[PDB]
PDB file of C-alpha atoms in Angstrom:
ATOM      1  CA  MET A   1     145.306  91.025  41.923  1.00  0.00           C
ATOM      2  CA  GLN A   2     141.934  89.805  43.190  1.00  0.00           C
ATOM      3  CA  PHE A   3     138.656  91.559  44.006  1.00  0.00           C
ATOM      4  CA  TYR A   4     136.041  90.143  46.373  1.00  0.00           C
ATOM      5  CA  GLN A   5     132.324  90.700  46.848  1.00  0.00           C
ATOM      6  CA  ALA A   6     131.393  91.388  50.458  1.00  0.00           C
ATOM      7  CA  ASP A   7     129.162  88.321  50.645  1.00  0.00           C
ATOM      8  CA  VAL A   8     132.085  86.069  49.722  1.00  0.00           C
ATOM      9  CA  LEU A   9     133.981  87.325  52.763  1.00  0.00           C
ATOM     10  CA  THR A  10     131.125  87.042  55.267  1.00  0.00           C
ATOM     11  CA  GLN A  11     129.181  84.096  53.865  1.00  0.00           C
ATOM     12  CA  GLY A  12     126.180  85.636  55.607  1.00  0.00           C
ATOM     13  CA  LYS A  13     127.797  85.401  59.043  1.00  0.00           C
ATOM     14  CA  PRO A  14     130.073  87.624  61.141  1.00  0.00           C
ATOM     15  CA  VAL A  15     133.771  87.730  60.305  1.00  0.00           C
ATOM     16  CA  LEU A  16     136.907  89.397  61.566  1.00  0.00           C
ATOM     17  CA  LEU A  17     138.977  91.386  59.123  1.00  0.00           C
ATOM     18  CA  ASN A  18     142.572  91.877  60.289  1.00  0.00           C
ATOM     19  CA  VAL A  19     144.833  94.472  58.635  1.00  0.00           C
ATOM     20  CA  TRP A  20     148.479  93.627  59.236  1.00  0.00           C
ATOM     21  CA  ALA A  21     152.078  93.890  58.061  1.00  0.00           C
ATOM     22  CA  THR A  22     155.403  92.134  58.699  1.00  0.00           C
ATOM     23  CA  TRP A  23     156.931  95.494  59.732  1.00  0.00           C
ATOM     24  CA  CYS A  24     154.363  95.918  62.518  1.00  0.00           C
ATOM     25  CA  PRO A  25     155.973  95.231  65.960  1.00  0.00           C
ATOM     26  CA  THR A  26     152.945  93.587  67.628  1.00  0.00           C
ATOM     27  CA  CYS A  27     151.866  91.596  64.574  1.00  0.00           C
ATOM     28  CA  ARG A  28     154.059  88.529  65.207  1.00  0.00           C
ATOM     29  CA  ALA A  29     152.386  87.735  68.541  1.00  0.00           C
ATOM     30  CA  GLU A  30     149.010  88.747  67.139  1.00  0.00           C
ATOM     31  CA  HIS A  31     149.487  86.276  64.311  1.00  0.00           C
ATOM     32  CA  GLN A  32     150.012  83.412  66.753  1.00  0.00           C
ATOM     33  CA  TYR A  33     146.886  84.396  68.667  1.00  0.00           C
ATOM     34  CA  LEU A  34     144.821  84.471  65.476  1.00  0.00           C
ATOM     35  CA  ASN A  35     145.916  80.910  64.761  1.00  0.00           C
ATOM     36  CA  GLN A  36     144.269  80.072  68.087  1.00  0.00           C
ATOM     37  CA  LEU A  37     140.992  81.912  67.406  1.00  0.00           C
ATOM     38  CA  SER A  38     140.911  80.415  63.916  1.00  0.00           C
ATOM     39  CA  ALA A  39     141.090  76.963  65.484  1.00  0.00           C
ATOM     40  CA  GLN A  40     138.133  77.818  67.715  1.00  0.00           C
ATOM     41  CA  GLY A  41     136.014  78.303  64.623  1.00  0.00           C
ATOM     42  CA  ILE A  42     136.296  82.076  64.204  1.00  0.00           C
ATOM     43  CA  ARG A  43     136.339  83.086  60.517  1.00  0.00           C
ATOM     44  CA  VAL A  44     139.111  85.607  59.910  1.00  0.00           C
ATOM     45  CA  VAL A  45     139.930  87.453  56.702  1.00  0.00           C
ATOM     46  CA  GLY A  46     143.386  88.975  56.420  1.00  0.00           C
ATOM     47  CA  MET A  47     144.567  92.069  54.603  1.00  0.00           C
ATOM     48  CA  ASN A  48     148.338  92.445  54.262  1.00  0.00           C
ATOM     49  CA  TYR A  49     149.016  96.196  54.163  1.00  0.00           C
ATOM     50  CA  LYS A  50     151.846  98.263  52.556  1.00  0.00           C
ATOM     51  CA  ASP A  51     154.095  95.234  52.817  1.00  0.00           C
ATOM     52  CA  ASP A  52     156.415  93.205  50.603  1.00  0.00           C
ATOM     53  CA  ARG A  53     154.219  90.434  49.184  1.00  0.00           C
ATOM     54  CA  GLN A  54     156.996  87.834  49.249  1.00  0.00           C
ATOM     55  CA  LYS A  55     157.772  88.577  52.897  1.00  0.00           C
ATOM     56  CA  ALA A  56     154.091  88.286  53.788  1.00  0.00           C
ATOM     57  CA  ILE A  57     153.931  84.925  51.985  1.00  0.00           C
ATOM     58  CA  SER A  58     156.949  83.565  53.842  1.00  0.00           C
ATOM     59  CA  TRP A  59     155.486  84.852  57.091  1.00  0.00           C
ATOM     60  CA  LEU A  60     152.271  82.901  56.466  1.00  0.00           C
ATOM     61  CA  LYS A  61     154.205  79.742  55.613  1.00  0.00           C
ATOM     62  CA  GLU A  62     156.566  79.891  58.607  1.00  0.00           C
ATOM     63  CA  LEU A  63     153.982  80.838  61.259  1.00  0.00           C
ATOM     64  CA  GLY A  64     150.906  79.342  59.628  1.00  0.00           C
ATOM     65  CA  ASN A  65     147.886  80.872  57.879  1.00  0.00           C
ATOM     66  CA  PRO A  66     144.843  81.614  60.128  1.00  0.00           C
ATOM     67  CA  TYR A  67     143.049  83.383  57.288  1.00  0.00           C
ATOM     68  CA  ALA A  68     140.098  81.794  55.443  1.00  0.00           C
ATOM     69  CA  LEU A  69     140.853  84.352  52.702  1.00  0.00           C
ATOM     70  CA  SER A  70     144.129  86.288  52.453  1.00  0.00           C
ATOM     71  CA  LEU A  71     144.344  89.671  50.651  1.00  0.00           C
ATOM     72  CA  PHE A  72     147.469  91.647  49.711  1.00  0.00           C
ATOM     73  CA  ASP A  73     148.268  95.122  48.335  1.00  0.00           C
ATOM     74  CA  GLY A  74     146.414  95.484  45.070  1.00  0.00           C
ATOM     75  CA  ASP A  75     143.446  93.334  46.035  1.00  0.00           C
ATOM     76  CA  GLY A  76     140.096  94.946  46.725  1.00  0.00           C
ATOM     77  CA  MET A  77     136.641  94.474  48.184  1.00  0.00           C
ATOM     78  CA  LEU A  78     133.311  95.415  46.606  1.00  0.00           C
ATOM     79  CA  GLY A  79     130.349  96.505  48.691  1.00  0.00           C
ATOM     80  CA  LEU A  80     132.460  97.094  51.789  1.00  0.00           C
ATOM     81  CA  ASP A  81     133.613 100.589  52.810  1.00  0.00           C
ATOM     82  CA  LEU A  82     136.330 100.690  55.465  1.00  0.00           C
ATOM     83  CA  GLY A  83     136.875 104.449  55.199  1.00  0.00           C
ATOM     84  CA  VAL A  84     140.282 105.612  56.465  1.00  0.00           C
ATOM     85  CA  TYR A  85     142.119 102.504  57.670  1.00  0.00           C
ATOM     86  CA  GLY A  86     145.458 100.750  57.814  1.00  0.00           C
ATOM     87  CA  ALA A  87     147.613  98.417  59.873  1.00  0.00           C
ATOM     88  CA  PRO A  88     147.344  97.494  62.659  1.00  0.00           C
ATOM     89  CA  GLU A  89     143.537  97.323  62.809  1.00  0.00           C
ATOM     90  CA  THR A  90     140.874  94.673  63.273  1.00  0.00           C
ATOM     91  CA  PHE A  91     137.269  95.058  62.098  1.00  0.00           C
ATOM     92  CA  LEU A  92     134.204  93.071  63.116  1.00  0.00           C
ATOM     93  CA  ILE A  93     131.768  92.827  60.212  1.00  0.00           C
ATOM     94  CA  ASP A  94     128.328  91.293  60.684  1.00  0.00           C
ATOM     95  CA  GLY A  95     126.540  88.852  58.403  1.00  0.00           C
ATOM     96  CA  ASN A  96     124.909  91.753  56.584  1.00  0.00           C
ATOM     97  CA  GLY A  97     128.206  93.392  55.737  1.00  0.00           C
ATOM     98  CA  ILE A  98     127.913  96.109  58.392  1.00  0.00           C
ATOM     99  CA  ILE A  99     130.984  97.215  60.363  1.00  0.00           C
ATOM    100  CA  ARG A 100     130.082  96.651  64.022  1.00  0.00           C
ATOM    101  CA  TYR A 101     133.431  97.372  65.613  1.00  0.00           C
ATOM    102  CA  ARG A 102     136.920  98.553  64.782  1.00  0.00           C
ATOM    103  CA  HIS A 103     139.939  98.178  67.035  1.00  0.00           C
ATOM    104  CA  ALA A 104     143.142 100.117  66.390  1.00  0.00           C
ATOM    105  CA  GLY A 105     146.188  98.347  67.790  1.00  0.00           C
ATOM    106  CA  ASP A 106     147.096  94.727  68.296  1.00  0.00           C
ATOM    107  CA  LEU A 107     144.482  92.040  68.839  1.00  0.00           C
ATOM    108  CA  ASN A 108     145.221  90.131  72.052  1.00  0.00           C
ATOM    109  CA  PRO A 109     143.205  87.908  74.459  1.00  0.00           C
ATOM    110  CA  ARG A 110     142.058  90.889  76.518  1.00  0.00           C
ATOM    111  CA  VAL A 111     140.651  92.952  73.630  1.00  0.00           C
ATOM    112  CA  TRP A 112     138.966  89.839  72.261  1.00  0.00           C
ATOM    113  CA  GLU A 113     137.642  88.560  75.577  1.00  0.00           C
ATOM    114  CA  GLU A 114     136.471  91.901  76.982  1.00  0.00           C
ATOM    115  CA  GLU A 115     135.565  93.958  73.919  1.00  0.00           C
ATOM    116  CA  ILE A 116     135.031  92.026  70.691  1.00  0.00           C
ATOM    117  CA  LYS A 117     133.887  88.532  71.698  1.00  0.00           C
ATOM    118  CA  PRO A 118     130.578  89.744  73.185  1.00  0.00           C
ATOM    119  CA  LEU A 119     129.772  91.589  69.960  1.00  0.00           C
ATOM    120  CA  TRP A 120     130.764  88.551  67.900  1.00  0.00           C
ATOM    121  CA  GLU A 121     128.365  86.338  69.864  1.00  0.00           C
ATOM    122  CA  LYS A 122     125.739  89.041  69.527  1.00  0.00           C
ATOM    123  CA  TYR A 123     125.831  89.007  65.734  1.00  0.00           C
ATOM    124  CA  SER A 124     126.399  85.251  65.485  1.00  0.00           C
ATOM    125  CA  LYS A 125     122.993  84.653  67.066  1.00  0.00           C
ATOM    126  CA  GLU A 126     121.543  87.395  64.853  1.00  0.00           C
ATOM    127  CA  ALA A 127     122.836  85.777  61.654  1.00  0.00           C
ATOM    128  CA  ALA A 128     121.740  82.300  62.777  1.00  0.00           C
TER     129      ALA A 128
END
C-alpha cells in the first residue's frame, strides 16, 4: 500500500490520470492507445480499480506499462480530491493539482484529439 503527494504525480506539469480495470470491456484497446500517447511524451498516472492485483500486474506485463506511476486498490493520493469516481474514467490534472477535465468512458483517439488534447496543450504552456 502506497500513498502519494499530489506534487509527486504532477511534477508541476499537467498529467493524465486513468482509472481502469481488467474487467472493463473497452480497457484493453484503451491500454494500447495509452502506450502510444505515453511514447509521445504524455505523462500518465494509472489507478487500477476494484480489480484483482495479480491480474492487473500480468496485464501490465503482457501489454506493457504506459504509466509513469501505477496505483492499485489500497493506494491513495494526498492533496487531490476526485470526488465520486471509478472505472472507466480519465482525468486531466494541471500542474497546480487542479482537475481541468474528466471523461467518463474509454479514452480513444477521438476523445483525445477533439476534447482533451487542446486542454492539455493549454495547461502545458501555462505550467511552462
